[PDB]
């Protein structure tokens, strides 16, 4: 600090007096992130856990919009046999926002799980359900062998084998072979039916109706931290106050129209936003020919470290 005065004054001799050689600011210790309550959202159990599905040609499409899509149940639960996810990893699914999401639920055989790919041919590919070349979607499969299987074959799906021509990608033909293929559980893993749900993704100029990742940490007060609750990012001191906000009002303002407080998007609490401590560094030292003793003066702040 004696040389800091020489660095500020640009001179090797320090005159007796008080000089401001620098400024100080306290860096944030950690990050505090809180999001609105993620419990009891709209699940995928309606398409996945449903009792009875339609056939491969009878496949139904559910429109997923204006809700939160939770993709962590798919890969992390390890209850599903296999999946093919194109263009993105199963972890990047939760980290992106989609404009529209479609779910195509159908049940295919065991050896037909390899027949679902963009731009491929097969028994169910051309005659029943086809994927376009540009399809970026992410599909997951699991076994129906203990449920949809019946002795002598199930008459619900009927597995229509024959068609006079080939179907375009994403074309549903409900027109009423058959001659239903045997679904009896006694068949091996190749002839046993599996449940396959195709997820169609769309990204447009319209705002995304699907919500992205959700993560929350612990809340700490009376410390300088980086705070982001769902609406705003910044660094400051979080302290609970006696202020009262209307239930439909979230962010507050000071006289300067700067945000002095934030409400928890999850629980009910009101914490003020105080900028972290800062100020100038004042050095008190006598002349260079007197002594080397210096005194550091923090302007307008109390020292809690020492």
């Amino acid at each position: 600090p004696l040389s800091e005065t020489k660095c500020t004054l640009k001179s090797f001799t320090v005159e007796k007096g008080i000089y401001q050689t620098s400024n100080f600011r306290v860096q944030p210790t950690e990050s505090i992130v809180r999001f609105p309550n993620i419990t009891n959202l709209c699940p995928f159990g309606e398409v996945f856990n449903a009792t009875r599905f339609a056939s491969v040609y009878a496949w139904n499409r559910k429109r997923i919009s204006n809700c939160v899509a939770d993709y962590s149940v798919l890969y992390n639960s390890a209850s599903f046999s296999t999946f093919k996810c194109y263009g993105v990893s199963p972890t990047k699914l939760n980290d992106l926002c989609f404009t529209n999401v479609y779910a195509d639920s159908f049940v295919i055989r065991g050896d037909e799980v390899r027949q679902i790919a963009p731009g491929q041919t097969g028994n169910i590919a051309d005659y029943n359900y086809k994927l376009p070349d540009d399809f970026t979607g992410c599909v997951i499969a699991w076994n129906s062998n203990n449920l949809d299987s019946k002795v002598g074959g199930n008459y619900n799906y009927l597995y229509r084998l024959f068609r006079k021509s080939n179907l375009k990608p994403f074309e549903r033909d409900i027109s009423t072979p058959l001659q239903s293929y045997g679904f009896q559980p006694t068949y091996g893993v190749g002839y046993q039916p599996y449940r396959v749900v195709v997820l169609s993704f769309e990204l447009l100029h319209a705002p995304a109706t699907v919500c992205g990742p959700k993560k929350s940490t612990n809340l700490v007060k009376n410390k300088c931290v980086n705070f982001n609750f769902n609406g705003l990012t910044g660094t400051g001191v979080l302290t609970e106050s006696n202020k009262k906000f209307l239930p439909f009002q979230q962010f507050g303002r000071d006289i300067a129209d700067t945000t002095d407080a934030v409400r928890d998007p999850q629980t009910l609490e009101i914490l003020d936003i105080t900028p972290c401590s800062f100020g100038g560094v004042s050095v008190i030292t006598p002349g260079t020919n007197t002594s080397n003793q210096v005194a550091v003066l923090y302007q307008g702040v109390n020292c809690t470290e020492v």
Binding site: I255, A256, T258, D260, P275, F278, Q299, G300
Partner: peptide
């Protein structure tokens, strides 16, 4: 005739005067 505390939040520092109010009345 706080406004000072709100202005200190945006980076505007208000320095305290060298001569306090108690010493001014003593000079008077």
């Amino acid at each position: 005739t706080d406004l000072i505390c709100a202005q200190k939040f945006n980076g505007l520092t208000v320095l305290p005067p060298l001569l306090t109010d108690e010493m001014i009345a003593q000079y008077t």
